[model samples]
Target: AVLKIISWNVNGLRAVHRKGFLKWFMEEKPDILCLQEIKAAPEQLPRKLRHVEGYRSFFTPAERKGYSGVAMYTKVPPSSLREGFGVERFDTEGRIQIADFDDFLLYNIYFPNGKMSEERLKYKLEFYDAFLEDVNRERDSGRNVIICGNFNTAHREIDLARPKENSNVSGFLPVERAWIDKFIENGYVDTFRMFNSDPGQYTWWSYRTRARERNVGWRLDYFFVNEEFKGKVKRSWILSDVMGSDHCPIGLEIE
Candidate 1:
């Protein structure tokens, strides 16, 4: 059987739990689910969600409470697990978690949003550096890293609607987009792009302006697999039809 992988920024797990997320999970039945911005810890989740079938879950909650957190719910048990980027200041926000199974090093990440302040922007850049360094090191060891979640940035003009109009926006800035190019150069394949090279394919739509109805959105969330596993990836898709979150789920199929 092939492995079905999915990544989504639920914005908040508590809210989605009440929005029929469990029902959606049962319907989709993905082998792995990487969730970002859970905004809650293991104990904080509704009991009903905790007992969902065939899922082994992991969470990294921010120390500050009710903000920035990441989670993974997998049907296959991982051999080892890790949390955070190993950078002290950034780790405290609980933005990253990983599960190392025999086949891949799976990263569930809630990448920092740099809109807060100049200092926060610098921190976000620092995290980008650290994350790339870690991915490089793992590549040197011949490991395939499958990194996924809300990247929180639109990578290219084609990745968002009205790109030129929003070029100066926080998530669409040239500097941030350049960083995405660097990642692609270093051998990470954005899975969704493998299927859709066309514009207007977005994973995130603003809650304001009724953006979803207009299809005015940004491709901020992504799933990137190391080049070595590119051949294993048979299909890629975005759950554009789903409506429980501001962002939608992206999927990858591996054989």
Candidate 2:
């Protein structure tokens, strides 16, 4: 069976809720959905769309209210769910949530934006190490893992527009992109690359440059299947057309 999963960074859940988020969400009807950059604690979210149809959800809010957070909505009940990997270095920012399904473990991460300061950039790099530790440890035990979210990094020149322009940016820096390469080298499959290894297919666009209109965007978000789960992956795509936030959605189907 093919189970559909979608991941998006909504900027702010409440804002998107009023601006066609519900309609787009319902039309997409993903079996599992991960939302990043929610910018509000669950309690602070407007109550109008509390019970979105067709799925149960899990929310992880930032320690600082209305800043950065993430959540998930899924039709399939997970076997286990982890808010963070229990790593203090990364968990302190409230950036991750993971659901363990019958078949595999899911990691939902709203990775830190390194634009804040030198300190934050260090933290972002540390988070990458911690994630590799966690995923690799679990993978060693033979669990199939699927990790995804607004990773905030552009993995390759094909993954972003104007690579030279973004080369030094937070999301496209050489160091950050190298981390992704290491992850794949250690046996993780960036799912979107699994099906179509082409340029121009992207998931994020800067609202400023009217980038989305020009299709000049970056593939910052991702869904990665552990090398072991590669056989189960059926398909994946960058959902550029359906948009309520700066980021469009990306999805995958695994059998």
Candidate 3:
């Protein structure tokens, strides 16, 4: 059996909910839907989005109001769920929702953005290191792992349009991009790259520059699985045509 999983950064839960989120959700009906950048508390969500009929929902909103948050709606209930990665600094930001399934440990994360300032950039890198260590520990325990969401960084030149112009940018910086390289080297596979190698396949478009109209964008969102479980992933692809936010959904099929 294969589970159809999708990850999307909705920019804001309430905003997208008003923009045909319900209609789209019914039509797509992914087995598991992971959402990031929800920026709303559970109580703030409308009843329909809080509990869809066919799915069990979970949300982790930031302690700070109207900030980062992640959510998941799954047809198949998880054995257990975690709201954070066990680090207080990262936990307070409401950046992760981990669901433990019989087959794999699934992590839906709204990774930090580093464009604000130098301090934020440093924090992003620190989160990367901490997350890597903890995830590796999980791997050693022998469970297959699948991580998905807006990673907030474009991993390679092929990942973003106008790489040369964006080289000094935080998202495309060597330090940020290198962590993605290090992650893959540590035995995780970027699922999208496993099936498609072509350029112009982007997940995010800058809402600021009107880039989406021209297909100039960045592949900042991703689905990654451990190398040992690579075969379990039947396929992965970007749903660029689906529109609601600056970022589109990315899909994964796991057996």
Candidate 4:
């Protein structure tokens, strides 16, 4: 059976809800949907979103009100669900939700953004290490992994429109880009690149610049699968046409 999974960072859940989020969601009808940067708690969501018909959901809202958060909606229930992977420092942000579906583990995450301060950049790098440490440990046990999120960092020069201009920017900095290289070296594949290599295919755009209209943006989101489970991945692509936020949805189809 083929499974359809979609990942999107809505910028803010309430904002998108007002902009036809549900209408678009229903039309897409992904078997599994992962959302990042929802920025709200369960109680704050309207009943319509809190209880989407035909799908069950789990949410991890940040301890800080209306901040970082992640959530999942799935038609098929998983064997287990993890809100956090025992890391207290990162747990408070409510940025992770891991679901085990027997065949593989899905890591739905909203990775930290490092644009605020130098200290935040350090924290972001540390978070990257901590995350890889945990996932590597889990991957060693033989179960395959599927990770999806708004990673906040573009992986390569091909990932951004003005790569040279953003060389010093945190999201496109050398250190941050190197992490993606390291991730690939460690046996995970960026699923979208498997099918397409065209430039200007990005998932995020800056609101200040009206970037999407010009197609000038960064590819800061991704759907990754471990090398072991690579065979199961059938297709991965962008969903830019259906949008209500600064960022758009990305999809993965597997069997």
Off by over 4 Å in 1: none
Q: Would you list the C-alpha lDDT of every candidate in the order shown?
A: 0.86, 0.85, 0.91, 0.91
Model 1 has how many clashing residue pairs?
0
Candidate 3 differs from the real structure by a C-alpha RMSD in angstroms, to one decimal, of 0.8
Which prediction has more favorable lDDT, 1 or 4?
A: 4
Where does candidate 1 have its weakest 10-residue lDDT segment?
Answer: 44-53
> Using Cα atoms with residue i matched to residue i, what is each candidate's TM-score against the true structure?
0.97, 0.95, 0.98, 0.98
Q: How do the residues 105-165 of candidate 4 rate in per-residue lDDT, one tens digit apiece?
A: 9999899999999998998898888889878987899889999998999998899999999
* True-vs-predicted CA distance for residue 173, candidate 1, Å: 1.0
lDDT, candidate 3, 15-92, per-residue tens: 888888889999988999999999888896678789898999888899999998889999989998988778899888
**For residues 1-255, could you state the per-residue lDDT of candidate 2 as single tens digits?**
789888889999988987898888888888998889888778756665556767887888878878898888988778767777677667757688878886788888888889878888888888889889988988788888998888888899998888999887888889999999998999999888878988998888989867889988888889999887898899888887887899888888999
The lDDT, on a scale of 0 to 1, for candidate 1 is 0.86
Q: What lDDT, from 0 to 1, does candidate 4 have?
A: 0.91
**Ten residues in a row with the worst lDDT in model 2?**
44-53
